[PDB]
Amino acid sequence: TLKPKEIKFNSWEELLKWEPGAREDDAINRGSVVLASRRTGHLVNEKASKEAKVQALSNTNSKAKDHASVGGEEFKAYAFDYWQYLDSMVFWEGLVPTPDVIDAGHRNGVPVYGTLFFNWSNSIADQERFAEALKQDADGSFPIARKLVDMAKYYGYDGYFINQETTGDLVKPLGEKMRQFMLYSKEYAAKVNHPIKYSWYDAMTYNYGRYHQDGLGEYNYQFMQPEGDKVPADNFFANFNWDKAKNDYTIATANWIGRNPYDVFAGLELQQGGSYKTKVKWNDILDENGKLRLSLGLFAPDTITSLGKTGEDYHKNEDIFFTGYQGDPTGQKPGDKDWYGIANLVADRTPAVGNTFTTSFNTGHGKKWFVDGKVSKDSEWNYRSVSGVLPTWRWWQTSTGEKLRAEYDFTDAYNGGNSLKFSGDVAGKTDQDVRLYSTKLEVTEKTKLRVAHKGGKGSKVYMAFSTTPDYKFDDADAWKELTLSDNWTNEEFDLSSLAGKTIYAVKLFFEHEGAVKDYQFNLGQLTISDNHQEPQSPTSFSVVKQSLKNAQEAEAVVQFKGNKDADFYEVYEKDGDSWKLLTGSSSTTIYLPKVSRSASAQGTTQELKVVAVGKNGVRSEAATTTFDWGMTVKD
Numbered sequence: 167t168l169k170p171k172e173i174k175f176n177s178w179e180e181l182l183k184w185e186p187g188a189r190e191d192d193a194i195n196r197g198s199v200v201l202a203s204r205r206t207g208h209l210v211n212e213k214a215s216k217e218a219k220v221q222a223l224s225n226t227n228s229k230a231k232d233h234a235s236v237g238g239e240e241f242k243a244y245a246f247d248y249w250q251y252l253d254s255m256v257f258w259e260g261l262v263p264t265p266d267v268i269d270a271g272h273r274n275g276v277p278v279y280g281t282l283f284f285n286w287s288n289s290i291a292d293q294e295r296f297a298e299a300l301k302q303d304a305d306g307s308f309p310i311a312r313k314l315v316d317m318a319k320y321y322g323y324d325g326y327f328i329n330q331e332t333t334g335d336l337v338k339p340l341g342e343k344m345r346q347f348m349l350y351s352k353e354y355a356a357k358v359n360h361p362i363k364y365s366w367y368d369a370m371t372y373n374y375g376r377y378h379q380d381g382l383g384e385y386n387y388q389f390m391q392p393e394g395d396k397v398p399a400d401n402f403f404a405n406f407n408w409d410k411a412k413n414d415y416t417i418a419t420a421n422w423i424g425r426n427p428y429d430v431f432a433g434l435e436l437q438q439g440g441s442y443k444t445k446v447k448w449n450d451i452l453d454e455n456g457k458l459r460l461s462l463g464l465f466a467p468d469t470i471t472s473l474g475k476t477g478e479d480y481h482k483n484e485d486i487f488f489t490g491y492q493g494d495p496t497g498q499k500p501g502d503k504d505w506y507g508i509a510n511l512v513a514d515r516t517p518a519v520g521n522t523f524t525t526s527f528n529t530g531h532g533k534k535w536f537v538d539g540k541v542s543k544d545s546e547w548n549y550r551s552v553s554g555v556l557p558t559w560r561w562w563q564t565s566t567g568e569k570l571r572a573e574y575d576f577t578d579a580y581n582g583g584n585s586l587k588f589s590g591d592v593a594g595k596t597d598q599d600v601r602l603y604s605t606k607l608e609v610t611e612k613t614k615l616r617v618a619h620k621g622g623k624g625s626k627v628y629m630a631f632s633t634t635p636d637y638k639f640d641d642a643d644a645w646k647e648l649t650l651s652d653n654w655t656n657e658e659f660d661l662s663s664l665a666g667k668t669i670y671a672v673k674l675f676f677e678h679e680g681a682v683k684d685y686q687f688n689l690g691q692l693t694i695s696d697n698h699q700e701p702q703s704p705t706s707f708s709v710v711k712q713s714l715k716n717a718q719e720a721e722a723v724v725q726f727k728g729n730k731d732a733d734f735y736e737v738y739e740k741d742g743d744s745w746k747l748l749t750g751s752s753s754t755t756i757y758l759p760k761v762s763r764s765a766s767a768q769g770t771t772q773e774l775k776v777v778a779v780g781k782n783g784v785r786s787e788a789a790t791t792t793f794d795w796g797m798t799v800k801d
């Protein structure tokens with residue numbers, strides 16, 4: 167069995183037998199990307215809050231039998247890219263998040279939590295399963311808590327959401343132990359140098375079994391009550407039937423016990439409600455100035471995949487959800503709509519901090535995979551481990567006249583599955599901009615800008631940077647004109663004149679001198695870095711496992727040693743005279759679901775290669791190895 171699979175335990179005894187490295191797919195199932203730091207930039211929406219937070223409880227993965235834990239050879243996926251508004255992502259489907267989700271979230275600076283679910287039930291079997299989790303050693307420690315911590319450390323994720331929906335006579339007395347299990351976990355996680363957080367559903371009361379308060383209150387406060395410096399639950403997820411009075415009570419209760427009210431996330435039932443069509447009592451959670459007074463808990467926002475038919479529709483629907491119907495995170499809810507875009511209410515954050523930032527707008531899925539503007543993988547995929555950093559703002563536009571339409575372009579890309587396209591009929595002379603990223607990038611004498619782009623016929627296009635935190639673009643040394651052409655080009659600009667300054671934002675600016683029917687410009691890659699070097703090639707590359715289906719089709723697992731400059735890796739096969747990309751991963755162990763040869767292939771072996779794609783956007787030289795079929799196609 168070469169295909170890596172989600173991690174599920176059939177009993178607590180099985181979990182107590184878990185050990186690092188003891189599963190054949192562990193090398194692939196581990197997260198590979200450390201949790202990135204983020205900045206919170208200047209507020210761009212007058213109604214947004216830097217205190218209010220958003221937690222997503224998402225069914226992130228395919229439900230197909232025998233789907234892989236890394237993704238698959240299909241475009242449609244929960245290719246989440248709105249990290250900039252999230253506090254955390256909860257992997258709802260199981261205890262141990264898959265590496266595709268962990269890597270994507272971590273690159274974007276968002277912690278990823280597994281889910282510990284105790285069934286909605288009063289069966290003795292379920293009451294016992296709950297009691298069994300809370301078994302203690304003589305010293306009061308909880309062995310199951312240790313295993314949960316140990317797995318978070320090994321697989322590289324950040325904690326758990328506990329949904330304790332089991333009730334009955336054997337459950338009622340266990341509130342104190344449940345609380346101590348969470349506190350103890352914090353002690354042990356510190357001991358092993360891998361802190362974790364817990365998020366707790368408003369379900370099990372301290373003394374009375376299951377009862378939702380739709381808030382924090384007199385029956386559940388103990389789960390949030392501090393022990394000085396430590397807390398049991400870090401976040402609290404209030405049940406869906408909150409209202410003004412319940413929210414008032416929650417705030418009073420949090421304040422009294424010495425917790426931040428914004429650590430309570432008011433739940434939105436998006437599965438039954440239909441994503442942004444969900445009716446929400448906004449008036450009961452917004453204060454007199456139209457600002458959130460509690461955080462937001464998104465239950466099952468992945469339902470949004472059901473609202474359209476295509477992968478392209480998924481992103482467009484997410485824009486309505488996260489940005490809002492008005493289409494610009496700086497704007498207000500339209501008067502004819504009830505839904506508030508998340509951006510209308512919650513400040514953005516950014517992982518684009520330091521001396522280096524790169525993106526090719528990789529959303530973790532595609533219909534094809536492009537390499538420097540050429541099709542390399544000519545077929546569909548989702549491998550979210552390689553998800554990159556998409557624009558902060560979708561879309562912050564100003565114009566002297568009409569505004570171009572901005573969208574992802576899955577038909578043409580520079581690297582990965584999509585670029586950004588800006589298009590429309592331009593009616594006459596116009597100047598306009600699209601503000602794309604919030605950043606905090608330090609410029610030195612060695613800093614350069616690399617920009618891949620295509621099209622723009624009938625315009626001049628510039629990239630401009632703000633060197634102040636309030637996003638003014640008044641610095642003459644921070645405007646660069648692009649040299650347009652009809653093909654993909656990748657141009658480099660010296661930013662040394664900005665040495666000692668900090669870049670806080672990135673925008674495009676377009677000038678049209680007259681009308682242009684069906685104007686189009688694509689942005690394919692953006693890199694600001696003081697490192698122009700190729701990363702070193704991977705080493706010690708080999709095929710470590712393989713399973714032939716026939717002489718033209720096989721599964722494989724490859725492994726190599728990488729280096730700290732690599733953001734992720736791409737694996738290719740040589741198919742006749744051409745290299746063709748198979749997959750990409752942040753990991754140094756990679757599953758290949760289909761190594762393939764044509765009917766006319768010669769010989770008994772076939773070359774494979776792996777390339778490191780740098781954090782500075784530059785590819786390494788390839789490392790190569792030889793896959794041995796052990797037969798010709800005609801034998």
